[PDB]
Task: structure prediction
Amino acid sequence: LMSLDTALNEMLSRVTPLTAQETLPLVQCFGRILASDVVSPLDVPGFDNSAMDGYAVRLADIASGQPLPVAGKSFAGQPYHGEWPAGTCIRIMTGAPVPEGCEAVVMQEQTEQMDNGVRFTAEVRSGQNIQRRGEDISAGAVVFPAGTRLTTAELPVIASLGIAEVPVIRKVRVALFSTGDELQLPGQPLGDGQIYDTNRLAVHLMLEQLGCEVINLGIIRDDPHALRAAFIEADSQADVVISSGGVSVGEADYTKTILEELGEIAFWKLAIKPGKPFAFGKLSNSWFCGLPGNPVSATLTFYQLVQPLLAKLSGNTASGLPARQRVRTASRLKKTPGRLDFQRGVLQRNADGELEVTTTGHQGSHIFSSFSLGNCFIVLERDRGNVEVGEWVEVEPFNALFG
Amino acid sequence: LMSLDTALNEMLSRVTPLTAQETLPLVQCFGRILASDVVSPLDVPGFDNSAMDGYAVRLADIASGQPLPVAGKSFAGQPYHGEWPAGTCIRIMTGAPVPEGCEAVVMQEQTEQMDNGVRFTAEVRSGQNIQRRGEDISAGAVVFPAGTRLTTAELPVIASLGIAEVPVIRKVRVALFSTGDELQLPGQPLGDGQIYDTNRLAVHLMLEQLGCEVINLGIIRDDPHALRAAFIEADSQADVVISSGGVSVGEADYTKTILEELGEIAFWKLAIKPGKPFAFGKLSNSWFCGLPGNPVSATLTFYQLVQPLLAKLSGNTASGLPARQRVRTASRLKKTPGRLDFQRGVLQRNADGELEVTTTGHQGSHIFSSFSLGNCFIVLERDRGNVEVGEWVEVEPFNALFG
Result:
């Protein structure tokens, strides 16, 4: 009934990214979000330097048509600062500063080393293979803007500017619980009708991998006052509160009325498969997400709804979730018009060399095994029907949460 | 001269995967390697249960095509234990135990109701939508084998068996250092030829994200006795010792001769670009990986050589490098025959739904920016030459280390 894009736009339009910040050493910044633009204090490189290894040379000692001896070297930690004679050259490695006077660097293309000097094939009237001070990064330049998630790609650059620490948005704090007399902790004997609580673990793990600070209140007992207080304490310590199962997703009961009293919660029926119900809304100081009890539905609903919400809250200006690509199915898929269906599939390269998807097996939500067997979602359009072999299909590779 | 495949295979062929273990609670096992088969202690489901949301019925009631009053519900924590009279059906959710005597489950979808009961609108077949005990998982069956990397796909399933903790292989321990008077720490000012140490941070970050325990010994004093003491410390504490800059990769000097004293180290020249030199071999109780000093080179060598080594050492039975897919370039690529070139590109969706690659721009090892702008490697074949727009090319998406 409610479309996914509509639900997702409803959620995101209402959220304000976090701004509270903290300053941490670079080694601690993996996956953290820059709170402020990193502006370079220095020129990179610090002085004119070589882009390649070979030899630094001059104007007229190449126009003289004769060989040029190696009068010294420059490695970057040992620059050449000698007396730098007339018709000679200076051996140079990549990133090493050019000696004073140098006007060109020649690679290992046009160098023939001899007894009496190096010989060169072409000439030049310019700074070939010279990085000028600040060609890469100029001082006062914005190297990375606020909102950038920091990775191995960005943090070493920041280290090359001489910066020990950078400001980052604080972690989104997420409180998590389940409730119901039927739920039991793994490692404890099941009582008569009981089942093991798995949703809560799944969400905790996904939360920690996403970079959130997690507050797991456990299983709250079937008691109005205990649930109300769990709600009150979670809301007062977290930016987001998640019921991983047990709180109403629409049905009338004592939990729904706790929701009515502590917040403004909407109960949606989404046009997705698997899944349908989702609760969402504002508490006094946090955003609430309520997931359905079925593990497949909860995990999928967390992955396609809650994850983007958390990305936006963290201050990240990229986006969560991977990008989709169009691929051929090598399997007949059964799809029923009316719901956007996130099937699980196996994306593999055929012998032709091209990527194709294949189903994992049964797509029913009575089993969980499709997530470890598959490596992607086949995202099949709401009004699409059955899908024959060879048709084109949208495919969303699993991110790190699932391997 | 020596190919990457040969070098890779000499590295891994020598390596014994770790076996010592520890037993952790599931919430602490993400990314950890299972030390032994998880063997199911039970049948899943423990009782014939429904594959579908709908109604549980008997074939004789369906054969009297009279609408059937709902006598009760079975949900999942709350099975139906009342009396189930002739002419009625039972409301049933996915996962819920099927009630005694039920011969079939009819999905909600093929079942429109009346004022006087549920009308079953399609053919009902024996056994339909019922998952029988043990059919998902069988008691005594291996659910996950030793060597499996645990993730959200797996841990919740383990939780559903009532198992609270599992044996996982101890973390790989990796010692790390660099040497050079030219190397400076952040915040410290930069003397004549000096640079900020960036490789060591890059490697540290990458090691932690791969789940290694890291022992970062800093910048080692520029003399043999200090260097000798670094190796003794590293080697007693670690499974892998890594020099991120400053220890010889073939140049004769006091580090080369210490390396040669403390181990059997080969110094390879590798038919790759960026990069080429790599140091590798056996210390008393650890493996040694020597990286070259250039950042683009050290990162690439770490990614394509050291990362697969750690994955094997860890006990993982899967690859930790992403798979390659075959794609068209939307860019002309400069490529010299003789070296296997791991260029960086930007894989993207064109307007016609097609994935193609674009160059990040300049591919010289004099700047580090290609790792940020990029999202993949273009792995151009050793013997291949320049490449034209439209041509097919192998492409390997960046893993989580670069976003």
User: Anything to note?
Assistant: The domain at 45-136 of chain A is CATH 2.170.190.11 (Molybdopterin biosynthesis moeA protein; domain 3). Chain A has four domains: 1-20+170-322+397-403, 21-44+137-169, 45-136, 323-396.
